[PDB]
């Protein structure tokens, strides 16, 4: 037996101790030591399924978001389902899940990041391009969602009100090779990487590590609060065997990238927050960066089931980081076919922003100091 | 059998 709001925590640690030591946990005798911070844990179910912290529209509406400690890779919190009023144990983890897509929140870490990283860019004042575009060999064209074009822009206000054009271009001009391994340097992977994913996590598999989860998010935003270096998500500490044994797992880091490419990206990021998209996370005394999603509809979808004028979403997401914690938030429906409407775009950020103030009052909230080879000007930040 | 799964401060939230 075990509490209500634990079940996905436990199920990601039954798959991760039988993973290390091929053991399932239930047909032996050990005892297992976890990475949850429980007060954070029960403040995350709180958000969920109460009316004190987020205004949600309805009983249904999902979200799904996993908490990382940016300097170990250890997830501190994952809860990818609120309101199961049918407890079998163990269910779909959704927090880990990879079959929805993450649309724009995959911009900063397979266009931007890396076209800095291989120095395509040389700071975030260059001058990118939004106009009319089509994706690279073929004759269909990359729309915003204003269906307009910003013109000449800097990458900065690229990334801040979210242009598909600047975005997409800027992963022709990176290399599909080149992407795909900064990805994998993050944690993520396609089967096959297409321009389509400069803006979607859409891929073609999701039979396993495909795709992004809130999981693969969580840990590859961490490499840009830490100055570029991804931990694999971490839900055990310790195993002890009932044969008296002991195996300690320590969390070991991997280069993703430059120190200053992590900084670019940060500053950047910032400015989503506070003067774009995610002003619903803005929190005027923590230092935090992160991007918003929101997904769309197929074709086939917007002609036969999708009836409306509005905007609509099948996913919104939001990724942000501070100095210390890293979050990534999934909000939408079970059936996809179940369109996001109006109030119901802003849960993902004020998911986030209510989970952030809880973690981070009371510590001094540090921000990012300027590194080696970086100087300021302006409104940007150029290189040497 | 019997296992027991801890949280980050080590205090006992689950038996399985
Ligand atoms: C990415 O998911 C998506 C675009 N990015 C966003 C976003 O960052 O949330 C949007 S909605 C955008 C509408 N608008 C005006 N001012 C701020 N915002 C938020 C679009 C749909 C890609 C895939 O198109
Ligand atoms: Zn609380
Ligand atoms: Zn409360
Ligand atoms: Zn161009
Ligand atoms: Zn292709």
Known sequence: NYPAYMDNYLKEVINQVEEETGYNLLTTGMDVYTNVDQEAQKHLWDIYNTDEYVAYPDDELQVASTIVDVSNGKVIAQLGARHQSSNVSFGINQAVETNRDWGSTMKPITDYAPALEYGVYDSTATIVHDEPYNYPGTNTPVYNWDRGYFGNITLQYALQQSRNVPAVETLNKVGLNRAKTFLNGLGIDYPSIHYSNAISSNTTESDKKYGASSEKMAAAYAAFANGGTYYKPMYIHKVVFSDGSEKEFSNVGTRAMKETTAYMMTDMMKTVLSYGTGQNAYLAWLPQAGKTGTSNYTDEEIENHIKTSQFVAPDELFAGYTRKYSMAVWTGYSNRLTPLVGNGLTVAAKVYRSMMTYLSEGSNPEDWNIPEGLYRNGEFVFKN | ?16
């Open chain 2, 1 to 16: 059998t019997s296992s027991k799964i801890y949280d980050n401060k080590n205090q006992l939230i689950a038996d399985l």
